[PDB]
Amino acid sequence: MRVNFDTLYSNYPSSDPSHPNYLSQRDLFTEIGWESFIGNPNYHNTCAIRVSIAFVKSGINIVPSSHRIQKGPYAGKGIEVNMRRLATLMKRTSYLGEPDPYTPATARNGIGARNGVVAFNNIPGYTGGGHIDLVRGGSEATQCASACYYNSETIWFWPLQAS
Amino acid sequence: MRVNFDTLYSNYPSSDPSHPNYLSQRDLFTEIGWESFIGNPNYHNTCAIRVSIAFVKSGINIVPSSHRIQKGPYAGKGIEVNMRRLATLMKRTSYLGEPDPYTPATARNGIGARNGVVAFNNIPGYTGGGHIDLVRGGSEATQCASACYYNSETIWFWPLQAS
Amino acid sequence: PAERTWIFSGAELKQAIEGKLAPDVSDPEMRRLVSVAKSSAYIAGVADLTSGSDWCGAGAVAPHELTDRIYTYLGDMPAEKLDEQAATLVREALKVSFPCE
Amino acid sequence: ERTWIFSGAELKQAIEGKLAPDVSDPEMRRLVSVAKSSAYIAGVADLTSGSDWCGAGAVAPHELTDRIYTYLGDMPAEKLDEQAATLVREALKVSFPCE
């Protein structure tokens, strides 16, 4: 599977108000027609929705999926809401294939100057699967589009760009 | 008056546990024989004591002074406890003279690659007049030995080194 | 009004969340990372202290999701409340977005 | 059973300048780590001002960090697995008691 990282990133809605592509949970759910889930405690964790939307808008459908976009130009396209299930799907040879596995002490130098998709598995104090996001490697720091969780047990990196 | 910045800095006891020269209030007051002031609310704010000690140990006495070192090789040397009074003293032609005055938006580029003494004047919620400290200018950030308060109204910088 | 004792006001927290509260840092991307680190950690302090009582979901909501709900609350509320201490505003935001029952 | 964002041990590591593995420059790593610990402490301090501790509006914020650090080091080591915020409130009560 071939993906342009700049296209994927341009299509990603961030949960970080500091980020140029910020979109609140309220606005994200409105865009895709999930207004009725806003503040439903099963839908607090948006990381896998946000990564699903980035792929769909870049012309890559998420199959299988737990849910579907209910409104707009991408109505009917698949959204995976569960971070563990999305990370599993991304691992398939038809999506991104085998990621580079890292530890907190190695993920920053492991990613390096590369850009791609990142999964932070088993975060201390959080019982969810963890966090999936887009990351840009730089000289100063790794920058995730929404949040980085180097407090995690393992970190999976799928490189898509080297620059 | 000329003083070697590397000597002054080497003699400075920091309130920042991350710093190589960290010394808790309890230890700082023990070294100078002020054990009886530990937890006295008039002595909570240690910034001007710490800068006074750096000067004294570098062979520059603080005259006049509110207080004196009561113990050790520097017994009888002067300590100014009040940040406003110490900043006033430093301004005298006999000490460092007129500093470069800055604002929060200009102090980082104003200091630049220079090292010296810094006074953060009129911080919301900080009595004694503000914070006085030693600062190292670098490419990445200004680094104060104990703390920086760019939320202050004015910032005074006295350069001592350019490296 | 200007009789404040608090380390962060609502306005300062909101500026940190937006990536604009580290004027001591030179690189603009590092400035953003430091600003967001401060807002996340301030929010975490209030969240951890109040998890039992004022809000529910502590083991099952990602920390950065709290920041998203706090930011929308800080923007929805009347602008003069931004001069209040940030911590009471965070507790209010958490109660509203993650109510206990 | 752990639901807290910072444990006592994680806060103490941040105070010591060692909780930003995403940051490349070691001096930037220290600055970011200390920014996190200062701000976490500020959250608890601002919320508990005048009920659990006294001196808000007088005592410089970085002085709180010094007293919290000595408390985190003095206390029995197994308490570091507790949520950091209750430890900070305890530290402030001890170092800046009210009546």
Numbering used by the authors:
A (entry chain C), B (entry chain D): 1 to 163
C (entry chain A): 0 to 100
D (entry chain B): 2 to 100
Paper text:
The type VI secretion systems (T6SSs) of Gram-negative bacteria inject various toxic effectors into the periplasmic or cytoplasmic space of the target cells and induce cell lysis of enemy cells. The various T6SS-related amidase effector proteins (Taes) are classified into four families (Tae1, Tae2, Tae3 and Tae4) based on their cleavage specificities. Tai1, Tai2, Tai3 and Tai4 neutralize the endogenous toxic effectors Tae1, Tae2, Tae3 and Tae4, respectively. To gain insight into the Tae4 family proteins, we determined the crystal structures of Tai4 and of the Tae4–Tai4 complex from Agrobacterium tumefaciens at 1.55 and 1.9 Å resolution, respectively.
The structure revealed that the AtTai4 dimer binds two AtTae4 molecules to form a heterotetramer in the asymmetric unit, which is consistent with the size-exclusion chromatography results indicating that the AtTae4–AtTai4 complex exists in a heterotetrameric form in solution. Pro47, Asp48 and Val49 in the loop of AtTai4 form hydrogen bonds to Arg108, Thr142 and Arg108 in the other AtTae4 protomer in the asymmetric unit, respectively. Thus, these specific interactions between AtTae4 and AtTai4 may contribute towards stabilizing the formation of the AtTae4–AtTai4 complex. Comparisons of these structures with those of homologous proteins revealed that the AtTae4–AtTai4 complex shares structural similarity with the SmTae4–SmTai4 complex. A structural comparison of AtTai4 with SmTai4 showed that AtTai4 contains more extended helices and loops, which may enforce the interaction between AtTai4 and the adjacent AtTae4. While there is no direct interaction between the potentially catalytic His131 of AtTae4 and Ala86 of AtTai4, which corresponds to Gln84 of SmTai4, the structural comparison suggests that AtTai4 effectively neutralizes the activity of AtTae4 by blocking the entrance to its substrate-binding pocket. The growth inhibition of E. coli DH10B owing to the expression of AtTae4 was rescued by the co-expression of AtTai4. The Tae4 family proteins have conserved catalytic residues (Cys–His–Asp) that are responsible for their peptidoglycan amidase activity. A structural superimposition highlighted the differences in the spatial arrangement of the aspartic acid residue in the catalytic triad (Cys–His–Asp) among the Tae4 family proteins. Thus, the present structure re­inforces the idea that the Tae4 family proteins have two types of structurally distinct catalytic triads.
